[PDB]
Design a protein around this nucleic acid. Sequence first.
RNA 1: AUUAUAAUAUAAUCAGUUCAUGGGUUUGACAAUAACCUAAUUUUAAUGAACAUGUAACAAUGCACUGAUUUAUACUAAAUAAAAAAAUAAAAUAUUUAAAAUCAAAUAUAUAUAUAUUUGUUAAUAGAUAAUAUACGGAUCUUAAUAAUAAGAAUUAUUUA
Lengths: 138, 196, 38, 165
Amino acid sequence: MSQAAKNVIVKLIVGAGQAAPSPPVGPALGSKGIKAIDFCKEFNARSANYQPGVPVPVLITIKPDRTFTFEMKSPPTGYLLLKALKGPTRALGELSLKHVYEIAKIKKSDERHSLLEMEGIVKSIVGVAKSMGIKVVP
Amino acid sequence: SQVGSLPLYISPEVQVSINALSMPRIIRKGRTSMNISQNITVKGPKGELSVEVPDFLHLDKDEKHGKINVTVQNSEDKHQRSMWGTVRSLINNHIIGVTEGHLAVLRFVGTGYRAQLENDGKFVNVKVGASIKQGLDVPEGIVVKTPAPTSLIIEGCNKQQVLLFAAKLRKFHPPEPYKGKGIYVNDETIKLKDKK
Amino acid sequence: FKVRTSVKKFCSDCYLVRRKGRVYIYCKSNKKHKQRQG
Amino acid sequence: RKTFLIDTYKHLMENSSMIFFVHYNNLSKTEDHHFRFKIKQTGGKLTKVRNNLFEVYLRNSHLPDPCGFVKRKEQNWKHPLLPLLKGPTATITYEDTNPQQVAKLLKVLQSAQDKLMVIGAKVENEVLNVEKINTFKTLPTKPEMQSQLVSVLQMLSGLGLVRTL
RNA sequence: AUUAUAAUAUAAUCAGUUCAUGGGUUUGACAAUAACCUAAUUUUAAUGAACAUGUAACAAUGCACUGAUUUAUACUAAAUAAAAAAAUAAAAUAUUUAAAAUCAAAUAUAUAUAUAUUUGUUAAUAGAUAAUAUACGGAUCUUAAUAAUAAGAAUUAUUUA
């Protein structure tokens, strides 16, 4: 009878991080039926560093109960290029393939995108350049 | 064709016989005709019931593995082919009824919407928003029972008859869209409109 | 019922039926799609 | 070649649940024995699978078993992924897909996962995607039942009929 | 024609993607705008190595078909099947409704088969509709073994005696 059912994952418009209750995102976990406070202890162990509370897509995955596996991803996909640079794709700031590969290393450094090949991440990097006002130099 | 080709499984308790009618009748179309000669019967534990059937159709009873098949004299004849798929399906339904029994749950939905067995099972009184009393007599073969007032069950050997009766019962008040409210036969659904 | 000469099926849930020497188009989803050929 | 050996390939894609399928080349003999042990738990033996006739076996579904007379070249190509394996494959006589059964097999597989080469998800009872196999892994079949053939099966006699009054 | 002997049945509907822009609101569908691309597990860091043929990256197999929704979520969702004595023939998506062309049949010339001419390619229903009275002129006509000496269009198409 028991089988892979469905629950919830909190993020809505991709959220941020840095470990905190989060207004009304924490309460949104309440709408989902789970709190968001002591998770920040472990979440802080998963959310800090030089980056100023980077908005790494809040992967607030929830189990069929309060108990839940909360995670995130690589530094905001687009932000990577946006930070590096402060027609072709969206033109504007152009990121050399070398810098693109360097950003691919950063993305692949994160365990979430570690599975993603740096070459595939480079293609995804062109996608962020296509969306945000950025450009990828061949 | 694809339906009629599917062989029917039988358990030892049930017997699918066939034999000619006492007075065969002929259905006359515009150009084509159809002579009802044979009369299939499905006798079993819960009851027994029969199907009057054309001459071109005939069974093929096998001793091994409890299978029986059904075939027509000309599958390329359209009318015969159409009949073949029907008859097989009918006798399958009969088999199911005699061994297991057909069922039809009616759930009543509404304030003061409920059924009642008035004449010791022989008349299903139905109260569904009417000054006049409503209801209808149960046919022969059909047995009705009411676990709850708002949840009636119809039961019988003939799949045709039971589900017809259920439909008749429903017809007093089919489900309204605005409030899911009325009489729902088996897994019946209705897309509820926004209130506004 | 929209009684008309032209009787096309609108959505995927529409289905055509031939009864009483008339083409009916009933529909399982949208009840507005009920049509009849004359 | 096909013949009886393709019938063993059919044994891999039979009913029930839980399958293995791994490259024969670079397969740890100790791990291979453990894989055989895993199939021996449910009863069976490892069966070697080679290409050319494997693609032919995959080409014909629910058809008379092909034999030496049947030729890979004589059969049409169309589907280019017909040969799922890229070389010799050693797979125990496992069944279909079951997380409970594969769990123990995975433990042995993980120990030398680098040495062996797993076979990508190939549409069986349901469409299986190698690229989406990650989702298939996260969302596998319901392993609530462990009896499979014995008991349950068709003798489970589940009288659900009416459950809501 | 193309795809065919490989579809309803069958889950999953995913990897850029949440397409980008504007945008209180918009992740499918807010309108505008854009429309193809990565992903192939058994395993990972802030100032450098195409990207490799691994027996194969590739695969539109979707810019959620399309609603849904405050926008999303939910949610259907292109991916597509089980099931083939095989094609010879009963799949879909269409275009088509033709003997011009091609093909077959025939005439005509030289005639051991050379040219030219001629002939051969859709059906039913609905649409249907006024006024003394139905009005194919009327009757009425579509056939059924069993079964008569015995019926079987009396309509349309092409023909015979």
